[PDB]
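Co-fold these.
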Amino acid sequence: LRQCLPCGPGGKGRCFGPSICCGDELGCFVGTAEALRCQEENYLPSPCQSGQKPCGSGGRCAAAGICCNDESCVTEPECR
Amino acid sequence: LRQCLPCGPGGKGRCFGPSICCGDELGCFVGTAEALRCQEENYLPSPCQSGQKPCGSGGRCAAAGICCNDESCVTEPECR
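Predicted complex below.
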């Protein structure tokens, strides 16, 4: 599968959704200027590979201590 | 009730959780440096007033198109 789109400061983050941009050390940007690029995800039916640990309801440990699916993010200790 | 703590760039955002900082036009920062100040919320038992529309369950429209509670945020059109 294709890698998820790079986003945020220095492209250190990855798009987990159309409006979600996260990096392990950066945290998660939801609906901010940093996640603007991620809008392209809506035009790629191809699911992407982040390589992050699965979590919650079909989620992914998008960042340290944060579990996000394509539309939400929750603080999760298990993601540390 | 006390107003919620200010956070983010130019203090235009406010803390909805210990790790969540949002601004109507800025979007939401979950676990990012912008939300570091929000940790202080953990040492304030009393609830704060954000003056924002309710949403989901316990959630508040923290930003245009985003509903958040103390530990999570979700893209929500009802918040636009």
